Amino acid sequence: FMVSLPRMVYPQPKVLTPCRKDVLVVTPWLAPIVWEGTFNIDILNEQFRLQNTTIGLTVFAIKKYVAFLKLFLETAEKHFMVGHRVHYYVFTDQPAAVPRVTLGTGRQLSVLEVERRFLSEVDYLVCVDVDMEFRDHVGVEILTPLFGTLHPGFYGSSREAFTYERRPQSQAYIPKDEGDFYYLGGFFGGSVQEVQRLTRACHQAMMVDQANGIEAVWHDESHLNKYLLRHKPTKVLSPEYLWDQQLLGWPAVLRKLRFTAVP
Numbered sequence: 001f002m003v004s005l006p007r008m009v010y011p012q013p014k015v016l017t018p019c020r021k022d023v024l025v026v027t028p029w030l031a032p033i034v035w036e037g038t039f040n041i042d043i044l045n046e047q048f049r050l051q052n053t054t055i056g057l058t059v060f061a062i063k064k065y066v067a068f069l070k071l072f073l074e075t076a077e078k079h080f081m082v083g084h085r086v087h088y089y090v091f092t093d094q095p096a097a098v099p100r101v102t103l104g105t106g107r108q109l110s111v112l113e114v115e116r117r118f119l120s121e122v123d124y125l126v127c128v129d130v131d132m133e134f135r136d137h138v139g140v141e142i143l144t145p146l147f148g149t150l151h152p153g154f155y156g157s158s159r160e161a162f163t164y165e166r167r168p169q170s171q172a173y174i175p176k177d178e179g180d181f182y183y184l185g186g187f188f189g190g191s192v193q194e195v196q197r198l199t200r201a202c203h204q205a206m207m208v209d210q211a212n213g214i215e216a217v218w219h220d221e222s223h224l225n226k227y228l229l230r231h232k233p234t235k236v237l238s239p240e241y242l243w244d245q246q247l248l249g250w251p252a253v254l255r256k257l258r259f260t261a262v263p
């Protein structure tokens, strides 16, 4: 049950004025593609807060990667789901190496040394790479049953150029005439149920490939793309959500660089 939104004063949307004229803002299966300018964050924040939404953010930090945790968490505190309940899940082989980062109210962190727990603790799961930093707003506009993010190096490429797994012997196989977009393995998420369905599917597919003596060209990312091709995401995030300014600069089409690679 969703309660009514309170009175709000904001610019009236204009039916005869496109949001963005330079980019596709909706997929052929009617899923919004999230770009700056397409959403009113005040309306969205209201909608999700009225649901007392809790977002889980998962990251793996093994070996030398534990060094990226401090900046990742500090910047997440400044830009990730601020105002909402957040639960960080850090999977690491070095529990004692996790930095002591100060968190805002309503936010907590759990260290898991290297399920049904996520189903009882959070509403949405966001899975990202740790060697990154938030530089701008990453909020509830991304929440939906299942979302993928456009790879910053292939958003303008034709499907034929996509680095999908091309060997029929692999479960991640996608022919040259198939494919919507090339999604990043480093930033995906959705409801706990949908995320677990995706990871369960990829885990099984990778096991089959392993038994068959084959390894997808881009590992988990290849399987993720196969899954999202066959199970269309309900929202697609623009490259604003995972960029590398060092390797790609700051194009005009990107009004904001929200989450980026650490040099």
Ligand SMILES: O=c1ccn([C@@H]2O[C@H](COP(=O)(O)OP(=O)(O)O)[C@@H](O)[C@H]2O)c(=O)[nH]1
Pocket (backbone or CB within 6 Å): 059, 060, 061, 062, 063, 065, 128, 129, 130, 131, 186
């Ligand atoms: O030895 C590793 C390799 C990868 N990772 C995690 O997996 C992510 C993605 O792999 P990686 O960053 O090495 O490649 P990229 O995805 O940067 O090409 C890393 O950012 C970490 O979050 C890790 O913890 N230990």
Ligand SMILES: COC(=O)CCCCCCCCO[C@@H]1O[C@H](CO)[C@H](O)[C@H](O)[C@H]1O
Pocket (backbone or CB within 6 Å): 151, 152, 153, 154, 163, 184, 186, 218, 221, 242, 243, 244, 247, 248, 261
């Ligand atoms: C995930 O890659 C990045 O965040 C940096 C992208 C920089 C611009 C060039 C993008 C294409 C080459 O990057 C590599 O692409 C392959 C798939 O073809 C994998 O996604 C690699 O992780 C990525 O580094």
Ligand SMILES: [Cl-]
Pocket (backbone or CB within 6 Å): 058, 059, 060, 126, 127, 128
């Ligand atoms: Cl993860």
Ligand SMILES: [Cl-]
Pocket (backbone or CB within 6 Å): 058, 059, 060, 127, 128, 129, 185, 186
């Ligand atoms: Cl991840």
Ligand SMILES: [Hg+2]
Pocket (backbone or CB within 6 Å): 018, 019, 020, 037, 038, 039
């Ligand atoms: Hg708009």
Ligand SMILES: [Hg+2]
Pocket (backbone or CB within 6 Å): 058, 125, 126, 127, 195
């Ligand atoms: Hg995850």
Ligand SMILES: [Hg+2]
Pocket (backbone or CB within 6 Å): 198, 201, 202, 203, 205, 223, 224, 226, 227
């Ligand atoms: Hg998969």
Ligand SMILES: [Hg+2]
Pocket (backbone or CB within 6 Å): 199, 202, 203, 206, 220, 223
């Ligand atoms: Hg997998």
Ligand SMILES: [Hg+2]
Pocket (backbone or CB within 6 Å): 198, 199, 202, 220, 221, 223, 224, 227
């Ligand atoms: Hg996957």
Ligand SMILES: [Mn+2]
Pocket (backbone or CB within 6 Å): 129, 130, 131, 186
């Ligand atoms: Mn990475």
